[PDB]
Amino acid sequence: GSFVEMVDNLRGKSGQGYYVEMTVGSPPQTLNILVDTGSSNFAVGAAPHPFLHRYYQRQLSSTYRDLRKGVYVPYTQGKWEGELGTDLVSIPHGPNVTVRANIAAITESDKFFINGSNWEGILGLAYAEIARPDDSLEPFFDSLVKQTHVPNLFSLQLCGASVGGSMIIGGIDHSLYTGSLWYTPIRREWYYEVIIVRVEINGQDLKMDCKEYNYDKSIVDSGTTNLRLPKKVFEAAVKSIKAASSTEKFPDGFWLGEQLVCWQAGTTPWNIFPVISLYLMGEVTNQSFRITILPQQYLRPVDDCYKFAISQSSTGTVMGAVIMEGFYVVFDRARKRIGFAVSACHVHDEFRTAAVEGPFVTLDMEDCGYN
């Protein structure tokens, strides 16, 4: 309930993700590693790429072990490749333990590292099922719990408007959230797969078949800025959002993310924008709960200017930073469930706050899953 030593261990820039400080090898080599619930591989830069501040020099590690295997990771918006191996890893501002973990030494990349970012590697916090090249490559967290007394749990508080947050490894810190934590079951253990059962725009339900909300999946991803929604769902949300906000007009290219909208410094009409609610499948048969986010979360700032941080997806719902910055997210891996509670650091106005309200009566929530 109290892990002071880990509170505020995350840093980052708006749109460049959240990172924690890790130490790899013997003697320890410090690196800033990106906290990603979207991927399952622990991969750090191993070659002098120009964007990189620092990098893994395997030549200097007494405890480096070569796995004599390569890994090739193409993905939608880029590509990464490297050499597999094992080394001692510890977290300066995390649990007081040292683990032998698999590390992919990144040796070629394209659109992977961000020019201007302050990280050199990625921490894949998801499950082996999606780890590359196969589930036989034990992810870091799996290595962590297997080799220590660290409970199979982690919680993130991502804070937004430079940024910060907390990664509590092996527990929950009560200071990071107000009110109650409501848990949704992890459908499958690959990505952190959850089920959205109902969508409301200022309480006005989107009235779509709930299978649409989760086509083809719904995941909780720290390694994604936007709240990404399935194409059909995105169209419905934008119609509704546009409707709710008609008091002011915006170009068509704004909802598409192609343009920005500016207001005189601190004269933003927050109050004109609706709140967005995602009802998630509850812990009990026929029971749900809802997570409510403000325009503060979806209108990502770039004379004040903002970007519409809601976008159309071809890979299903991605509950990215736009969602995670409003809540304290518990990854209760032991109980195959994900808890949500109001972030003590979420951004809000004197009239509305992000909310986690419950319980609700929702039928055929299993029917919202996609097969």
Ligand SMILES: NC1=N[C@@]2(c3cc(CNCC(F)(F)F)c(F)cc3F)CO[C@@H](CF)C[C@H]2CS1
């Ligand atoms: N969850 C994700 N992780 C990945 C990733 C993340 C970030 C950073 N995330 C965006 C920021 F910066 F806005 F937060 C990055 F720069 C490069 C990346 F390769 C690593 O896993 C790939 C699958 F193997 C898919 C991509 C995209 S989505």
Ligand SMILES: [Cl-]
């Ligand atoms: Cl406690």
Ligand SMILES: [Cl-]
């Ligand atoms: Cl469908």
Ligand code: NA
């Ligand atoms: Na509390």
Ligand code: NA
């Ligand atoms: Na696309």
